[PDB]
Ligand binder design. Structure first.
Ligand SMILES: C[C@H](NC(=O)c1cc2c(=O)[n+]3ccccc3[nH]c2[n+](Cc2ccccc2)c1N)c1ccccc1
Ligand SMILES: C[C@H](NC(=O)c1cc2c(=O)[n+]3ccccc3[nH]c2[n+](Cc2ccccc2)c1N)c1ccccc1
Lengths: 496, 496
């Protein structure tokens, strides 16, 4: 099965209203920049962002010019002529709209609250999709909380029902309408809905893990924002998942959620695989096409794992644009975020940066010795290890944020497509390194084991192993006289 | 309120069928031994044991001679003339009848399954109580498993209704018919039903904690079988309660069930008090009137905390009676258990035993240097700390197993009555020692705490404390934008 390659296309309302394909000063990345070659390297384009209005329906930003917006979407759907597998999705949400303190957060909470509101919202999604020519629905709520999860899920089920009907009605069996979400890529936000991952994923074609922004100005110590594996010299974090409303025992929580742990991409993938009902083929690994910049770092380790003096406020509170060489940061008035395209021209422009590599996290980073700057980002070389990981773990594919941040040649997108599909690329000997792996074990990734069948009437000692009702169980203490699952003495440790 | 003093009277079927008050070789402890003075020192006598037959009704052992059994009961109920507060209870169950592999275990499991079976069993309990002149019903099932608890509880509720009605019908408002159980006194067996303690205790007058047999031949290391507080030099155990179906988070389970922990009487009491809905006044501390003997111990600490060569099979598999001086062990064909009366005479006979004292556990023990023997037991001085504990923790009183194991002067029973009621006994200065206390915290023992009210729209750092909806909550990590109780980030740490 061909791996998914899901690239976000984000364009602000202002850029839609003044859309042009001939002037980077108003629209830096028009649809024209997506050539036929790039469209063939993509499987999905997530147009972003749409929102949920106060009428609890999916809708565009009220300031959007509908005619210009329809034209941009048409420019995107025209790309399907170059790739009959391409889907133009649209995304509802994003951090700005849907975060706890975001402008529209209440609309997300209310839209999923009742059967009537969910049916009304679900219909609005399909309607938006058919009216504008999209190929599926992507929900990016960051993030539903525990009491909202069940309503959120019933909404996803309802959208799945109407999409499947719309697929049959439209004869789209060859390219069915799809439903996806962007999921959390770190344990803290994941813990909000972690216990109900199976029911969340069941109606989805993919869950796109936002396995980036694992470091940023909101953290006291600088770090890699999308490390694949852990670095023992780097910071560790409290495993919030051991506090999720799972209803598991102490042993189960401990074996599944070691704490502290390394906040890595591999961690977020394994934590999804630990739950029953979450198939690997539905997991998509997100990767960033941008870097995160810190100032005020110390020396001695290339800027890694150092305290810093980067403002953490949103938006950027000053007009001090201290990322040398990033005049795209001047345009956006924020020196903390730089696209891969900008970072490339910073490296080749003699600005004082060194490209260093951490062979444990398998990610690059830039260090500025003179002004004390640190940048964490990804490139075509980090994508080689992540692509092999995707294949080894039988994941659904890759997602990235976002297209407009690739270089003008599109090397990041091409690298991803190459690593999955190029007949002349062979990563069988690529060294995945000795960085720390996430070693938790849960109900969904229990190892295959063999054990004698349980015998009623037997008294088992501590550590005895038996097979029962499909699993291998182990006693946590001695003198066990009841059956596995009947008694808290038995721990599930193996499968089949 | 007078503290309860509940003494079990156990007499096997063969002793009932051949009952005599003139021959200790046939009946070692006839009812005659309980004088009016001793009768005034008791509040309850639990006659034991009755059983549940295959008709799912309460009944005597089929081999019992009914006329002789009535004679034994009448000798107990006649004692009520010397103490107008005394109740002669009868107990259903015990280890031999009700343990998982016991002869009648299925009858207990099946009796509580349905409304019809529970009603039939409950009525049989009242019918036995009135027919033989008992004053209440005591259930000693060792122990109901997790799936049986709800049915067990509905059975206890149903007995409560018929007892309350029977009290009205008989004009016994002055001495109402009572309902009790013996509960587990150690975490392993307690974990079977721990989560449902409140609903179990709700219909009861008392739950009698079997806070003994916390050491025995089934343990590899010798230890005190009823230590009041923990000895750091002694063995520690896996805290099974952290594996019970409580639905708590990792932090809550860890806060409530530190592990490993000292298996003590204080542990079992505090673990009951940690649960909401379990009033201290209903908790009764059991104490043993017998000792447990081990052979093959090493020296250096009086036989404490040593490996041993004691058989653990039941019954005792040989005729090797290695407990010097214990003639009663020869009669009973088991050198591992000795009544306090017998242990006293062993100390009086120059058999090689020394009485030592552990001032951490507040319990005595015997050590035999010559043959390497160790005995854990209780006496009148250990009862001084346990009686003071009962008063300090506002428990309902004391229970003991069993009357027939006291000496003929009744010093153990007289000691308990003295420490609770004698005007000339003063334990106000008794030093409870520095033994380890059980420090767990749960919902029934959350401390009162004060914190500023939670503020919607605020971002909290890690460790912040707020008051909300009746509790004080603490953040387990930073950047918290959700309400307490709404999210896995908040930990209940105090009550408002
Ligand atoms: C999609 C991706 N990421 C966000 O959209 C975003 C993610 C976080 C975040 O994980 N996060 C985690 C923990 C605490 C705060 C916080 N805040 C976030 N802010 C808001 C923000 C805050 C401070 C500084 C900059 C931005 C955000 N916009 C992105 C978007 C645009 C450009 C590049 C990348
Ligand atoms: C009421 C008290 N206690 C028992 O009646 C008893 C309690 C256990 C027990 O807690 N326990 C806990 C864990 C594992 C096994 C086990 N077994 C028990 N056996 C049976 C037994 C088995 C092996 C060796 C000796 C005795 C027992 N009779 C008693 C009764 C009469 C005379 C003295 C004391």
């Amino acid at each position: 099965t061909r791996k998914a390659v899901i690239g976000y296309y984000f364009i602000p309302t202002n850029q839609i209203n003044n859309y042009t394909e001939t002037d980077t000063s108003v629209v830096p990345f028009p649809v024209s920049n997506i050539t036929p070659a790039k469209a063939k390297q993509l499987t999905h384009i997530n147009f972003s962002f749409l929102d949920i209005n106060s009428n609890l329906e999916c809708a565009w930003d009220p300031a959007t010019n509908d005619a210009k917006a329809r034209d941009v979407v048409n420019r995107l759907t025209a790309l399907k002529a170059h790739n009959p597998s391409l889907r133009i999705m649209f995304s509802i949400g994003g951090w700005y709209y849907s975060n706890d303190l975001g402008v529209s957060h209440a609309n997300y909470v209310n839209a999923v609250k009742t059967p009537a509101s969910r049916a009304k919202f679900a219909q609005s999604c399909v309607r938006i999709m058919k009216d504008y020519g999209f190929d599926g629905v992507d929900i990016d709520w960051e993030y539903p909380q525990a009491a909202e999860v069940d309503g959120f899920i019933a909404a996803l089920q309802e959208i799945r029902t109407l999409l499947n009907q719309q697929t049959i009605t439209d004869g789209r069996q060859a390219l069915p309408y799809q439903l996806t979400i962007a999921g959390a890529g770190g344990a803290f936000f994941l813990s909000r809905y972690y216990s109900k991952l199976a029911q969340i994923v069941a109606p989805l074609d993919y869950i796109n893990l936002m396995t980036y922004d694992l470091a940023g100005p909101w953290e006291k110590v600088t770090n890699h924002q999308a490390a694949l594996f852990g670095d023992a010299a780097g910071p560790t974090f409290y495993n919030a998942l051991r506090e999720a409303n799972l209803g598991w025992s102490w042993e189960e929580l401990t074996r599944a959620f070691p704490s502290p742990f390394s906040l890595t991409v591999d961690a977020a993938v394994q934590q999804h695989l630990m739950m029953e009902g979450v198939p690997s083929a539905k997991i998509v690994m997100g990767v960033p096409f941008y870097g995160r910049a810190f100032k005020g770092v110390s020396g001695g380790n290339g800027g890694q794992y150092s305290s810093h003096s980067t403002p953490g406020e949103d938006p950027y509170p000053s007009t001090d644009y201290w990322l040398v060489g990033c005049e795209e940061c001047v345009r956006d008035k924020d020196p903390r975020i730089a696209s891969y395209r900008q970072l490339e021209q910073m490296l080749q422009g003699n600005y004082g940066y060194q490209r260093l590599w951490n062979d444990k996290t398998k990610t690059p980073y830039l260090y500025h010795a003179q002004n004390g700057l640190f940048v964490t980002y990804d490139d075509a070389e980090s994508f080689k290890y992540k692509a092999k990981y995707i294949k080894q773990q039988q994941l659904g594919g890759v997602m990235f944020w976002h297209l407009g941040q690739d270089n003008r040649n599109g090397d990041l997108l091409a690298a991803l497509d190459r690593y999955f599909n190029a007949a002349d690329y062979d990563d069988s000997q690529l060294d995945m390194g000795t960085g720390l792996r996430y070693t938790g074990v849960g109900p969904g990734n229990l190892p295959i084991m063999t054990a004698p069948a349980y015998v009623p009437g037997t008294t088992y000692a501590q550590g005895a192993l038996v097979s029962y009702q499909g699993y291998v169980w182990q006693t946590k203490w001695g003198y066990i006289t009841s059956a596995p699952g009947s008694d808290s003495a038995w721990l599930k440790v193996g499968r089949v």
